[PDB]
Each structure stands twice: as structure tokens, then as C-alpha cells.
Amino acid sequence: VNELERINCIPDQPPTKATCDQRGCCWNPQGAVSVPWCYYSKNHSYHVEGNLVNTNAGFTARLKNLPSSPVFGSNVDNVLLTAEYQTSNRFHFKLTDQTNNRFEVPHEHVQSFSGNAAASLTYQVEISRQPFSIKVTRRSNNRVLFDSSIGPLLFADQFLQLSTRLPSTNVYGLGEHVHQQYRHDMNWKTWPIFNRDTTPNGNGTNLYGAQTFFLCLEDASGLSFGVFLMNSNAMEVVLQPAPAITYRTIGGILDFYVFLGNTPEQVVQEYLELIGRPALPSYWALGFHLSRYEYGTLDNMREVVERNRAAQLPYDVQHADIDYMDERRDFTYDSVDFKGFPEFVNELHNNGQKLVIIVDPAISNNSSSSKPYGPYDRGSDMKIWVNSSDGVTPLIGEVWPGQTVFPDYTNPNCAVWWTKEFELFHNQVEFDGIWIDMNEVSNFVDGSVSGCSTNNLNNPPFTPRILDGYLFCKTLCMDAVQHWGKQYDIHNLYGYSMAVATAEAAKTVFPNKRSFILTRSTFAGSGKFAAHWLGDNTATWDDLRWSIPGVLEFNLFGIPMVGPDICGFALDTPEELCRRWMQLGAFYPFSRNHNGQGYKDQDPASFGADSLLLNSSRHYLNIRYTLLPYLYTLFFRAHSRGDTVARPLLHEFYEDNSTWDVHQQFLWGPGLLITPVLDEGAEKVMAYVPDAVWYDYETGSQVRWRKQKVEMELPGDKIGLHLRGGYIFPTQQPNTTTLASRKNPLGLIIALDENKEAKGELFWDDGETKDTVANKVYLLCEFSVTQNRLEVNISQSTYKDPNNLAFNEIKILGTEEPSNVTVKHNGVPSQTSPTVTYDSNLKVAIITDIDLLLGEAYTVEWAH
């Protein structure tokens, strides 16, 4: 009835009463824009047949199809509901064809459940039988979280749909898209999901990855929940103002998880506990990365490397794009334009830097007796290509080198082939990390060099609103064949399988190291293997603004090392845009300036040795590097516990509804507030100051604002950076590389809260060994301040850095003058009495001539 609650029965064409009648739906052409004229009745779909059956894990139910017209075809007579109370905070239910096995995602991390129902549930499940619906409610307040009763269950071979009411309009997630805002537009929006090489622009299309997870903040108490659909077929998600969300997919099964938490962070941690927590990055990967498509020659690349080094830019990583290769073919380098490549790699390494190489999936099939191409010959020997529908002939498409075949990374034999290719190539060019691109998989022809046969896979009864309207557009035929199944079912898993296989190759090429993998295409869980960048953006102010929601969303998806191409991939970048983008970009979890072919240089040093852009870039990159121990400890918590790294204001300040749609500012973890200027010509920014004590990072002075909108003054050389009272931030004196910075003196910034208290922590390991956390080879220490006292305590202590690191400076914000400062080491008074400098105007104390060894317990005490 209520028009906001109508579930659209004609998603496929403009609505007509004739089609409405044919489908047995309800007709009412009255309503506002976007309200469906034709909608499902209150008894379309399925009913429960007989009784539910208790099982050890939860229960099952048989659903029987309520007689109806077959809109998009073969509609399943008998559906089985299997429900599992997997944990106190996670519910799993799956709807399958009772009579036939159907494709299920072969996820690498998620395991089948074998236990008994969890005790102490935070939720209750309710089942209605006529018609079928399922509801998940929060036990403590009976808030209805998931409720499918707004709409039917639809379950045909190539058309599956289920809807849920939502308890609020605070909805975040879904991908990969450019949403433009972070809090969802619930006003009749459809988001298609199907991995596609397309521009992240203002048109709201399907982009490179597939992420079905969303989080909902139920109210200001912080209680939140999330939902994940384990399905890799083309789909779309429909948001409406009831509020409700509908999932509509074209194959597979409806395999759902519902997660509850007391805060938005706890929901993310529950999601990541299920699909896999992100890999811990190499510490060097947290530094600044520089890149462009078509330096053209090694000489031109060297020029760029050298002018940025000459400028003393913090600068850890150089990427090499397809111009390094011999005619854009993997596992080669151009012996003329890139003559001396191995010597250049030595220079990079000698200067404490890292090389990341681009590698594409598609392999040139141009190889002869006369002119052999090794990777193709060896791949063909092992028979690891994606085949055409005939099941035996490798599919031919077209990418950078010309005609190509495509590896089937779902075949574990393919990982063996891939690893060997990397071993051979690493012997020639000693790269340190790998950038996997075009892995949607991207094809320059639609389907294959012979197009695609018309059939129900290439041309399904219902096509979600993907870019160009055909599944095989700029990708492979839907009836192509791989180890895990047909492309129709596993298309969205290509980039995921490739990331898995590339991590496997790293085990051999980089024994016991993390290395670094940057991936374009992703599926749920890709973060366990890889970082992500947000794709081929454009040098516009809109693109700068749109990057923040994309970063925040990928942190929800457990891919916290994420960022756009700073300054913009496509087009020449205006100096002002690039300056603002470098200021902000210094605080993306993944910080990379990358540029498209032919455009004017946009590396920082290219703007002039004395320029405002270079000076500002260097300044804020130096702050980023100073705070790297804090950022690294955030990545430790994402890896070990599932926390976000780049974090929405509302995850910390959910009590305050002014934060619920803030997406022009974000946090690093709980304590650092980042406020960019995001408008052309502006020297200020309208910003929200949450309900906490804040201190300006640069001056240390407490801001006079709290829980209110403000116009923050930020001239051309500034970005807003504020530290939260109650938090202690570990720092380390910066250098132009992390190789070197990791050997420098440490520091602490203690930002006092109103009670003159604060707490913080520091994770420290070797920065590069894989699984130091799982194998327990690390240091974790805690800092806590009360009146008159700092305690440094050690909770895990199985790694001691051989560089004799020590805290040599402590800066205290929001303090009255400390006097008689005293340092004790395990109770014993130690090392003279430190030097204390005090600014009574700003209420800042700095303690120096101190040496608190990393890994040792101390008490530091003072009077007022």
C-alpha cells in the first residue's frame, strides 16, 4: 500500500498495465517520481510447507512456490531455507533449490559451518509461513533489523530477488561505485554490480569490483548491523525510502549473512571475521608511491626519480607501467627504451626505494619457432587458459599487446605457471611488489575476437542496468569456461582469483615476506591479499571530492590500503587542484600520484624546485611519515581485529547526528581528524568539529570549537589536521624513505582530554615478515596518562628491534606547566631529570633529553 513500500514488479521496461496484468502485479499509476506504477501484491512468492526442522546449527524450512506467472523464466518449485546461528553476533541463512545443486561462490576464506547454534545470541530470528518471510531482530530492544516481508522471494534460474526493510536511513557501503556521498541516497536508486573496466565518473555505473556489504547505524546509541550477500553473478541493489533495500541477481543462490554490533566498528569487525581480515602491509608500502603511464623511456623515468629525490620528497616507491615492457607484453622489458633497467633497479634499491611493476593478466598469443614468447608457450604447455564454450579451445580476445589468451587463475595449476613466470622475470628485473591491472577481466573486444553466441548466458532474460547493457561488453563471453565454472557465474571472481594466485607466487619470489600487491578488480575478501586503487579518475575538483567516500567504503570492505590517483589520472592537472590533492593525498591510506599517457607531468618536483606545491607536498608528506608508527599500528588493528584505518567521523561520534552524513572529512583511526579544502579557489572550509577536545597538529593549540560546524581557515599551503583529546600518538622522526626512517628516534604526542588523561598504543615488528602477528613475533606497548603520570607498559614482547630505538621527546597538549619531571625504569629512578620546555600561552609542554627504550616499561611523573 504505502507508496514508499512498493516493490517494483517491472524493473525491466517502462510500466504498462498490460504487462502488470500479465505478471499478476498491482497497478497504480498514482505516485511521485520514481514510485513504481506496477508492484508486487501481498501474496506473490513462496509459502512454508509444513513444519520447520531443528538442526544442530539452527533450522531448515521447505518453501513451496505460490502459483504465479514466470516473468523471467524457470521459477523454482521447491526452495530450501537453511539457517545457522553461527555466532552470538552473526546469523547465516541460505535459500537453495531443494531438487538441484546450483552455483555457490567457492570463497577461499569462508568455511562451511559444522558447529552447534551459538549461545547468548544478540539476535532473534522469526519466520512467517504465509507468505514466506524472514525477520532478524535485535534481542535487547526488539529492533527489527532484517525483514523480508516488504516484498516477495523470487527464485528463478536466472532471476533471484529478496528485499529487506531497514531501521534507519543511515546506510553505508556497496561497490564498486562512485556514490558521490557516503551516506546512501535512499530516494529510489539502483546500483548495478558487475566487474567492469569503466571510468569512475558521475554516471553511477558498475566499476571494477563487486562488494555486496552494507552497514546500517540504527540510532545514536551506536547499535548497528550489516548484511552481506555471498553471490558473484551480475546483480543490482535497489534502495528506496521505506527505507528498504532489494538485492536482484541473475544466478547462483541467495546466501546471506547478518552481523550485529554495539558500534559501527564492531559491525565491520564481525564482517571481516567472516570474509577475512586484511593483510598487514609491508611498512614501506605506507610510504609515498610515484607513477605514470608512459614515461616512454628509462631515461625519462630516471629524470623524474632524480628530481623528486633532489627535492628531498618523502618517496619510497616507484611504479613502472606497461611502457617498461617489450611491446606491452608481460615478463619482458624493452631492451632499447629500457636498456639498463637492471642497473636502475640497483640504484633504486641503493637509495632505499622499492620498485613495483605492473603485470596484466592477458598473454599475447603471438609466438613462433623463429620468435618464441616464453609465457605463452609455457602457459599453453600447461593448458591453463580460459577456454571458449566448447570447453577445449583457449578463448582469444585483445588487450595491450594485440590478440591475447587469458589465464584461468581458478586452476591451481595456473598458480604454478604464474609463479614460474615471476621467478624467471625476477631474475632479470628485481622488482619488490606487483601491480595487477585490467583484471575485471578487461577485453578490448566484446566477448572474444568472434563476438559471443546468442544464448541465455550471453543474453539473459533479465540484464541488470550495467554499463552498455550487455554482460560481455569489454570482457569475456559469458559461456567461456574455467576451473571454478562458466564466466556467467565467476566473472566477478577473476580479479579475486588473480590476487590469490599472485600472493601464492610471492611465497616463492619473496620467501617469508609480505611484498606488496595492488589490484584493480576485487570481490569480498580481496583485502586478505591486496591493496586497491580507485581506478582511472580525472583531474577535476569533483573527482577530488568523490575520492573520500570511495576510500571510506573500501575500509568497510576490509581493503584499508586504498586511494585514488592523486592529482588525477586523465587530463593535465591544474596547479591548484594538484596542490590540494597532494595535501589530502598525504593522508590516504594508499598514497600514490599516478598520471595517464601524454598529459603534462604531475610529479611534485615537476612544479618547480621552489614551488608552493612542492613545499606543501613535502611538508605534509613529512607529517605523514612522522605519524607512520601510528598509521602502522592502525593497520595492525585492521589485520588482527578488523578495525577500519581511514574511518568515518560517525564511527567515533555516532552519538551526534551531525556526523551521520559527513564525507568531506575523515579520521585516521580514533584520534586524527583530517579536513581538506575541496573547492576551487577556496582558502577556507566549512567543517564539522565533533564533541571532543581538539588540538591543532601543527601549533598544538586547543581549538575553541566543539560539537559544531565551523568555517576553518586553510590558506593555499594548509590542510586541517587535529588531534583528539584523550589519545596518545606514537611518532618517529621522518626521513625520505621508511628504510631510513625506521632507524630514527621515536616520540609521543599526548593530547589530554578534559580530565587530563589520555591512552594510546604502539605495535612494532620487523616491518616486512609475513605473519609476524599469527606467529607472535612483535612488540605491543600501551601508554596511559593520568594526572601527574605517564605509564609505558608492555603487553607482548617477542620482537626487539636491533636499532636500539627509544622515545626521545614527549609533547603534551592541553597541560598546565609540568615541573620536577622524573623518569623511572621498572621503579628505579633513571637518567638525570629530563629537559622541559613550556609554552604557557598554548598550554604545550615538550620533554626532551629523555631516552625511553622501546620495549621497556617506564613511569614518567611530574608536579604542577
Ligand SMILES: *[C@@H]1O[C@H](CO)[C@@H](O[C@@H]2O[C@H](CO)[C@@H](O)[C@H](O)[C@H]2NC(C)=O)[C@H](O)[C@H]1NC(C)=O
Ligand atoms: C581448456 O582446454 C584444455 C585443452 O585445450 C583442457 O586441457 C586439459 O587439461 C587436463 C588436466 O590438466 C588434461 O588432463 C587434458 O588432457 C587436457 N585436455 C586436452 C585436450 O589437452 C582444459 O582442461 C580446459 N580448461 C577448462 C577450464 O575447461
Ligand SMILES: OC[C@@H]1[C@@H](O)[C@H](O)C[S@@+]1C[C@@H](O)[C@@H](O)[C@H](O)[C@H](O)[C@@H](O)CO
Ligand atoms: O597500464 C596502462 C594503464 C594504467 O596506467 C592505468 O592505471 C590502468 S590502464 C588504462 C585503462 O584502464 C584504460 O585504457 C581503459 O581500459 C579504457 O579507458 C577503457 O575503459 C575504455 O573502454
Ligand SMILES: *[C@@H]1O[C@H](CO)[C@@H](O)[C@H](O)[C@H]1NC(C)=O
Ligand atoms: C549513464 O547511466 C545511464 C543509466 O542510469 C545510462 O542509460 C547511460 O547510458 C550511461 N552513460 C554512460 C556513458 O555511462
Ligand SMILES: *[C@@H]1O[C@H](CO)[C@@H](O)[C@H](O)[C@H]1NC(C)=O
Ligand atoms: C636519512 O637518510 C639517509 C639515507 O638516505 C641517511 O644517510 C641519514 O643519516 C638519515 N637521517 C636521519 C633522518 O637521521
